[model samples]
Target: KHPNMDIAVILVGTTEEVAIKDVHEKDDFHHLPVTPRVELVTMQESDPKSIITRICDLMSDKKVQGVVFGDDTDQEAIAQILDFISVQTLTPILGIHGGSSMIMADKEEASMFFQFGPSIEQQASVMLNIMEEYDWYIFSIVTTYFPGYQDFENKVRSTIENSFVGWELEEVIHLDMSLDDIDSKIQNQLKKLQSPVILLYCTKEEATYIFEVAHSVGLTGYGFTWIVPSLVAGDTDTVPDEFPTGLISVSYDEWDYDLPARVRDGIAIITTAASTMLSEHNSIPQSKSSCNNIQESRVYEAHMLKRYLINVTFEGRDLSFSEDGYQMHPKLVIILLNQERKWERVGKYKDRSLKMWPVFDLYSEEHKDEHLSIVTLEEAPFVIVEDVDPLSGTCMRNTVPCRKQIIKRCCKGFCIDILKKIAKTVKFTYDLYLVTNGKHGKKINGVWNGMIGEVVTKRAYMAVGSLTINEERSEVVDFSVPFIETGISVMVSRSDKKFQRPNDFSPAFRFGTVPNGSTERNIRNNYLEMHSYMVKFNQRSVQDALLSLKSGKLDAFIYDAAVLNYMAGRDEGCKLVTIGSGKVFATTGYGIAIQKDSGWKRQVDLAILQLFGDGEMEELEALWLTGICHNEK
Candidate 1:
């Protein structure tokens, strides 16, 4: 019996060798171990990889104990199909050395630790650190030493670069400086750079030098810059000496944390970069930084580090505890989560009914009122068109009633078109709801709520395709595919002529608006800096800069085409800009909004795709032309 490695022997009284041959039915060790007599085979190999492979192949021929040996080895290459026994032996070694047994050589085992320890713990820790040391770390590439480490550092930098490529380059560091000088260097860079993350492209040696300086200046006290552990060459390499004690060391074995995050970071970097890089005629000025002194100044990088710490704890869970108050947009987080699994609604529309409905019903005499109503859009889908004489504040005698009737007919035409499509699709039920303008200066909460409950009672979905869909509001209620894509640009009564093009408005131009209006809010939030325009979130009040547009004293008003069009027709002096650029607003993507967690979203998306593919979108466009045309007899 051998503890680690050995050879087996057979025993018999006299004819043992003969009995071995007779009972085992062989002249060699290939005979069965349980036979009357037999000898076991053994092979000696020192390399863990080879020995393990051999033992695996020959395990049936010999007892498990007779072929074991202790030696240095790595078996990651063959881990998928089979695990190398060396892992079982190394588990205790890692624990003995006070190293984390969480990082196992086994891929599956690594996955477990990745989820439990490094992945969750490191992410939380790193996020905290990032909050504190916003721009503390300077990403730089060292040409002299550790190409692998440099490449790895660049990979991360590139990932971040890729994430924010088109983002304004706050500052790019491609210089060499001593560790003692790091605190001031970072401080200067922070003042010089606007971005929160400072990518450092140096080695463990560089990290040591930098951190040493950080410790001296007490930068490490506030968690100056949470350092990402330098990427090393050897798998089992020892931790770097200069590595700060409190700073966490996330590694390759901890790839569980670094890998997924790196991937996500890369994705964010790439998407933002792509969006910005590809954009034309909308670029903002690139900011420049003036170099300043590095001596003991009021701007201590450590205080910023404190800010980072406060910020991390402020918003929650940043491991580095550095003081840069920045975070990926919430939408970005949603985007990454979506990448994990874009789960579609699994079921189909259950109440679909196969029936064809008429697109329009017009009776000349008996149904004249209904006929005129249908022909001229007098009622349902509201369209208010105005042909006003500037001289008379009063609309022409017949204009008010006739156009109201026309607006309804036009709306009905589109609704009929929509209904026709809905009818064609068997087993479909559309729920209808209306977006009210609060009915003459009031909140339409009751109207909207009542409509929603009413539709729900019928087990139908909300249909607001006739009106413009606000993306944020759509999140609360499902919308069908948009029939339009244009911004609702309101003309500033006396705005400079140069501000005519949608993009020409500068942040300097102040527009009056209500806080709750989605269009006004979106433009203010997203375009003010880029467009050089500011929106004052107040209704048309005397304090507001641009009230003429709202008071009808301005040349023209720009709101959503649908809303503005309605207002224009009701006021004869007002009319949507004719012979103007096709766009009254910037291009906005519109999609159907659905109830939260409702399975109807996917169906609507699919149905929209079908409409677009089947030429139904084009057909709907033509129907709008005929429906809204003033030339209708």
Candidate 2:
């Protein structure tokens, strides 16, 4: 029988054959019992039957010993080829890359597979570690309807539930969609789900559609978080024009311990040695009567190839049969998209632990003292801009010149103090200034006017005041976790008999409120009847409106509950009362506004949480929102 010839290397899809060709040209395989020969075949443009026919022809015409398959090789095509061989003749195959082994599992003797990527368990464990680190107990999986997605989804679910208890998967949304329907689908899903975090498990094509649709609908702006698979970032041949500002992904890469490098070095050394060994053996004469028939010769050659692969060992790793054919260990890294939409390596997951970058260490040391510009508005109990006059034993007006004296004593109020405390914790300083337009923020002609405008235009780093965390403002600026809870309420004189339910309040009673820029004004416009005699005051503030209500010039003052409470409590026996029986018309949260997509958002959020955890937030609220003014006569 003719001696076994070369090992054929088959390339399918986009896998390149240059490396194999280079190896074949430089190495001499002449030292083994049967010298190994190398031949390359490209099959991406061919059908499965054509590839099978080509392989059969090679086996029949050439004295082919074994075949090595690339990752791009179609699994189903390879499996069909293997089945054809098992029924016709024995031809051993070695898969250089692993995935989709179940198709060929029935013909176990026909092929040996090697996997150089992270196993499903390893990938899922890394994802779970991230979820736990972020305290994400509830999240959903967003994926397109595709093959193998069920397995991926099931694996993630099983891994999370089995590893951690008390955690819930909010929902799994399967999209049967085209790019045309993506906007509506995104709108529908966001409307239904209150979950802020979603795990994306789809192909790159599907992810592009989802992100594009989300961007079109403004769903990626705020209040939504996507936990992407690692490969999404790896497949970056094309740069996406727009992605979510705070996107995060978990991916596996070579471990820093030089394990993969060691493997590569070992493979190179073995390949060179094998080439020399095969070349030396090719000169040996074969026995004329070694095989009785062609079928027996094929079986004998297949067994020889299998034994050659099974005994190969490198360094401390066994290169033989593994749990998943070839055992692979991959280290995981967390990828973050910063405000610039550029990728940042945030952390690494290894040995079941997630190590993240320090919160304050995001920027360089030199830039640590970065000057942050703050745009704020004057609202009582939030950012009270009163001038200090210790000599006169009284407070003065809030003018540019007076603000300098106020800054000497430091700005006072719930928001200002919170900013000071947060700055101290985060170790950053700022220049606090009022909004340029002096309006909190109004969306007109698709452009913002006040604090939010400063942030969106990059004129300010943060907006610190009684900034309500509303949907419209959130679309343009990011907000920290709410620091205070408040709602719209009515302030009236103690003798006012018309105070009742919002709708039942006396229709003809005159209502006084701040200018159109105030939250109170927004509530009045949206809820109150147009004929309710609503008057928005210009020169007078909410405090002035309260005094007018006390004098009966204004029948009622509609304002923030916290401000009304503070004013009514501090009134020197004028008899003022805030009417709200467990009901405030427009309940909302107060948040510190920061530039949209700012990396400092996480730092600010952390600082706020530290204050809350240490009971400082409540202390500040007490002192500023309800504490008495000792100097008041």
Candidate 3:
């Protein structure tokens, strides 16, 4: 009673199985006239030509009306087959990709295309939606060789480049994580992400393991977001405990463990289109056996098949194609993890529109419950010692190899409050100690002493003071982003006399600062004419250097501005006067110091950024730098 048609479906089998006897023969399509047979092709290295041979045979068979290519069919082989097929009289070849190698890179090479799964474009679009929701215009891409990832990365790159609103691509990383050893390059990039959003594309297995490394590097802490697509967001229940809290994941509720659903629907698409075609033409024409000669008649037939496939619906599903050939997905969803580590379904993409629920950050703070051993040297109003006993070059318990643990009786000041702010924001607890060696840190002949040695020996988790961010310390220890940007200062005895510059001081006039400090280094490199005549304060604090200036023993005291400015503020009668009252030549941010490539760098840096950006650091100025003198004003 129905017009009969014969169609061939090619299913590619993997190398791990010999599923020939484990093959399939099936179709429950409502189209009764169509008889579609499954030709299961198992890949054989000996005869890699099996698919090409099958195609040649199918071309010769006049019974076979059209062909279907399932997902996971070797794409390179398809490219090879397309080589002659494009030249040959048009044969109907319908390609549908689900969870498999992406369709051919060049769109024209493969004529008709439909994707049964979420397209990379859709994934990238979802990330942009989330980014915009949070007012995040900047993002980084950290990806691996997880299959078909380049397509996803390029989609993000393309969309961002074409955006009307300014969007910034902060960094692009190639993270091929090795299971046994975490790559140093990965940690190096991970510690320095300025952008708050990271678009991560990798497999679930790879992603699950990488989170451990992220945790170790403090990337899993606050002020950053990582959004990954379906391949990495497999199943919520199985998403492991180590996956970072506050991670945004892209996935679907109707998740497929296997390709059966897409394969079923993709097969139905062919039948629905074929049924519609037969009705319109009454007879479906066969493809020419040889493509040595081109013909227009079959070309019209191939074109018509594509038209019906795109235009028709599959079981009430509105089938459509992007101009770039991706079959638009209707039910994509986004879920994110919070402090509770529960998956929160926050947004959805359906029917060409995005719908989102305001993600009120109602989640409780994520506490790491980690304890840190932090060391510091008082650099005055940055770190002011109170009523407390010093280490006196000895540990409390005096173990095998002793370490110090100086606590709350330790000290208090503007910089002291900053450490509290950082600790709270980063969700960690710490014990504080002053460096016994009385040096900030210095490396001589490959021997490190002072605070850096404490960090290098793992005796201290980090060091904080008026620590400058410089090449030498950076090579030996990681520095958090600057909490305060300042420069060197030239302090004179509370002078009504304002000097134009440090050079204004005569060679005979004695001036000095901590000899090993960044302030002295600045003068050595920059003020060469003044440096040779300069005096050196062998072992001292900003207070000590200012003591020399106040007594007129030293004509001026040169040191970091944060330290100098605070002293200017602390002087009740303005006993110590700094020239500009703000800063001078050797300007640099005073960063928190930690062991080089340690896990604490980003955590501290993020907290430091929040403090500086949110004007919290301004309040700190009022508390410390805006002292009796009111220098910041």
Candidate 4:
């Protein structure tokens, strides 16, 4: 040993001292000294200037060999200390941690600051990697207008611009206004931007407000996708209830050691080494007043001490400074808020690539058992309406019902049976209703009507009937896999001999068909040139078309093969004959309809697939297809 020496350790706050003391106890620094007989002169103050004064006294004290400190002191105070120590004296100072230190340090050859956390640059890189993973290159960013955040926001902006070729930056939205203005501003931005993706870089309070406004504007669900940087969600806090269910965030991977524990360990290792050096340095311990005097006298020493601690490595966790004074390596993880409003770690972004879990499946058991509201149309063989007579319910199957009071309406057809089977297979129940409007819903002025309207308005979970899966309809509502396939065919009076060829159609003759139905769409696309005159019969049932044909008011009725055949056979005057073969016209499939982005689509799709795979669909079709007009045929 080179006699006893004292090392001065100055902290900006008592909390920092307590933190160091905690580390000292846990790391057993008192018993793990590198050398024997060294005194640690610890000083605590609220003012950075006061801390610098203490550091100066420690610098000139012959008994003290070096100094240890932290960066939590105000930035201006640290800059002043750095200025004095760099120009005034040569005493050594060791900086344990600080973000400001990197910018404040003046030495060009080496850095005196050491940080254990990811830098602004590293965090921005991680966020960029996550954005690229989702192909969300075009998005707007919303950041808080807090002063400290400007540097961070600018760095992130630079990273994005330099990173990828076609990575688009739509707009930089700033949150500098009051809460009410922020709400209006975010709403305006969302309304004007067509991109569904948004990048949010704000505090928890701001995020909460933004999402609250988003929900109010119907922008928080489904098509909208929000990506937030890690710092925004770094706190162990829950998002507000109104936050969008599918929000996403990117963050650094969970560190192995807790932040507090790591800080403590780092401090303990530095202080224990400093204590050991004091014993070996051949300097006698000085009084507290003498140490204070030295701290004031040698203000320039703080700079030299920080420079020495820069390259120095410590015990415990082997923490050391990177060449640029930033944390060396870090990993990133992507998180998602699922439908259940729970946070899930969905994937990781590392090595500049993203690895994620399987795509989320919404048809799990947790989604089952909820009753669904289904809307349907009374189309024969597919959706058939009957008058249920509960009073005389026991009447023979083949006999006409005894004149009794008509009860509630009931429906049973191929589609109904299929719906039942699917519900059974998927373990969901549904209530069925006929669409108030007779037409299959068509979009007009961005509004939907008929059965599809019920689903679009969320009045019904889905519609089950003979809904054709046309491109236009599919654009507005999701459709299940087709359960029934049929085609449009020409239905003519049995005795009509003049209309064998479609080109022989006459303008004098009028044709009637369902309004907004697939048959109408098909005729417009395929047979418009062949037909001279056509009329859309907007009514609750296709019976009016048959009636018009029977009365000779309509020359022909064009409609679905199943419905036309069923009605023609029963209407004595019409006694219609369908004129078409496989080559004459193409067939189309009918699918169930639900709102776009409805979570129930997946379950319904699975159920329909299950029925088809089990042969239940064929069985149901065979059972119901021939009964729409059984005896009349």
Q: What is the TM-score of each candidate against the true structure?
A: 0.27, 0.45, 0.52, 0.47
Taking the tens digit of each residue's C-alpha lDDT, what string does model 2 give over 22-108?
A: 233233334433444556666655466675677676665555545555434323334445445544555444443322221223234
RMSD in Å for all candidates: 26.8, 14.6, 12.2, 12.5
Alpha-carbon deviation at 569 in model 3, angstroms: 3.0
Which rank order by lDDT, best down to worst?
Answer: 3, 2, 4, 1
lDDT of 2 at 442: 72
Best by lDDT: 3
Which pairs clash in the backbone of model 3? Answer: 88-291, 487-587
**Deviation in angstroms for 96 in model 2?**
15
For model 4, state the Cα shift of residue 358 in Å.
Answer: 24
For model 1, the local distance difference test gives 0.32
In each prediction, how many residue pairs overlap at the backbone (N, C-alpha, C within less than 3 A)?
A: 59, 15, 2, 11
Name the candidate, 1 or 3, with the larger TM-score value. Answer: 3
Error of 3 at 421 (Å): 0.7
TM-score of candidate 1 to 2 decimals: 0.27
Q: In model 1, what lDDT does residue 580 have?
A: 44
Which is the better candidate, 1 or 2, if ranked by lDDT? 2
Tens digits of per-residue lDDT for model 3 on 465-536?
777877777877777777676877666674332222344645444566677676666656666655565544
